[PDB]
């Protein structure tokens, strides 16, 4: 199983309630551990802004984001502004860096953006930095494993 | 689904254009709530549009002029623009978009329209 | 800076096009085209959504397509309820904002 911690995000001078119809719950909402980082107004720069979380317990922490692959290069200036948009993971044993994909696709489920997630586990007692430029989807809460279980595929009835 | 406008219908030049629309139902926060307007000619002009929480998204054509604001707990919002020349006598619309974005792009189920005249 | 005829015609049950002409900084970037239909004094429905998707109780007779900088709207089966306006809408940046098009006056014959 798997038990939530809230990472405790604030930001400012920027929005965090970008939307989609996708994740319909009764209206245009997003994922519910995430938070869709936005730019003011429509074309406004994207400040770069840095945001850590300390793992505080003694189990191992999942920490989860994700990247907004725009459809078209017009799309990012509108959502997060003019520029090239960076962002930057990192914590004693991680050291990468994500770059968005913006460009043509098709539709799916109507709409040709992407939106793909990276994940990394935290030492306990570690610390994650995130640096961003914009087209990043933070996240809200990091994941805790619970402890031992089975995973199988099956098409038949439980019993 | 219900979409009510309602407001000053009949006003001259330099004067200030404030309508209010209100709804059933469907409650905000679940998309974005716009300000369309339609001169009786020809045409579909998007002026503005807000959410529950009260961000705005204008047309920076019409900025500076518009103010949008919303009545969260009576469910309505209004519209506030502006000083007023005579080329926005027009039908206005409220209208529901769907929230895509940061934006509204498509709107599904318009109000009826309030026909608003700024002749001299 | 959307472009539509202003006048098409056709005879019951025949098809017929609606273009919305656009430029390279709203059809042109990846922004999506939609279409709306106003019955005389009545307000637009929704019609052809995300540039080929029809909303609920919106017949197969209408029929949405995008290609490159322009799109284009379809009626087969052309019925007296149909004679309306329509309107294409996308979004543009380089104004910063959603674009609707001049309409098109479809006048059903007989």
């Known amino acids: 199983g798997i038990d939530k911690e809230a990472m405790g995000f604030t930001y400012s001078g920027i929005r965090t309630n970008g939307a989609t119809s996708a994740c319909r719950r009764s209206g245009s909402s997003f994922y519910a551990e995430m938070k869709w980082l936005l730019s003011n107004t429509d074309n406004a720069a994207f400040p770069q802004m840095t945001k850590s979380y300390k793992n505080t317990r003694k189990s191992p922490a999942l920490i989860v984001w994700g990247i907004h692959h725009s459809v078209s290069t017009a799309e990012q200036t509108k959502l997060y502004g003019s520029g090239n948009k960076l962002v930057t993971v990192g914590s004693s044993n991680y050291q990468q860096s994500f770059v968005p994909s913006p460009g043509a696709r098709p539709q799916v489920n109507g709409l040709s953006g992407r939106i793909d997630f990276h994940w990394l586990m935290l030492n306990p007692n570690d610390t994650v930095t995130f640096s961003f430029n914009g087209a990043f989807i933070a996240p809200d809460r990091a994941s805790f494993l619970r402890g031992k279980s089975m995973g199988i595929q099956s098409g038949v009835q439980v019993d | 689904l219900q979409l009510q406008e309602w407001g000053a219908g009949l006003l001259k030049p330099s004067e200030t254009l404030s309508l209010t629309c209100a709804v059933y139902?469907?409650?905000?926060?679940?998309?974005?709530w716009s300000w369309i307007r339609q001169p009786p000619g020809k045409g579909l002009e998007w002026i503005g549009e807000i959410n529950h929480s009260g961000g705005t998204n204008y047309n920076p054509s019409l900025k500076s002029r518009v103010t949008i604001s919303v009545d969260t707990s009576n469910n309505q919002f209004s519209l506030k623009l502006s000083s007023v020349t005579a080329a926005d006598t027009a039908v206005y619309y409220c209208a529901r978009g769907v929230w895509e974005g940061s934006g509204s792009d498509n709107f599904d189920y318009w109000g009826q329209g309030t026909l608003v005249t700024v002749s001299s | 800076a959307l472009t539509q005829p202003p006048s098409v015609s056709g005879a019951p049950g025949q098809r017929v096009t609606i273009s919305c002409t656009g430029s390279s900084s709203n059809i042109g970037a990846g922004f999506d085209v939609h279409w709306y239909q106003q019955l005389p004094g009545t307000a637009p429905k929704l019609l052809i959504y995300?540039?080929?998707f029809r909303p609920s109780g919106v017949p197969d007779r209408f029929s949405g397509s995008k290609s490159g900088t322009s799109a284009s709207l379809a009626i087969a089966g052309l019925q007296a309820e149909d004679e309306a306006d329509y309107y294409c809408?996308?979004?543009?940046?380089?104004?910063?904002?959603?674009?609707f098009g001049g309409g098109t006056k479809l006048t059903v014959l007989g």
């Open positions: 995300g540039n080929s």
């Open positions: 139902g469907g409650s905000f926060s679940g998309y974005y």
């Open positions: 809408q996308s979004y543009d940046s380089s104004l910063s904002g959603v674009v």
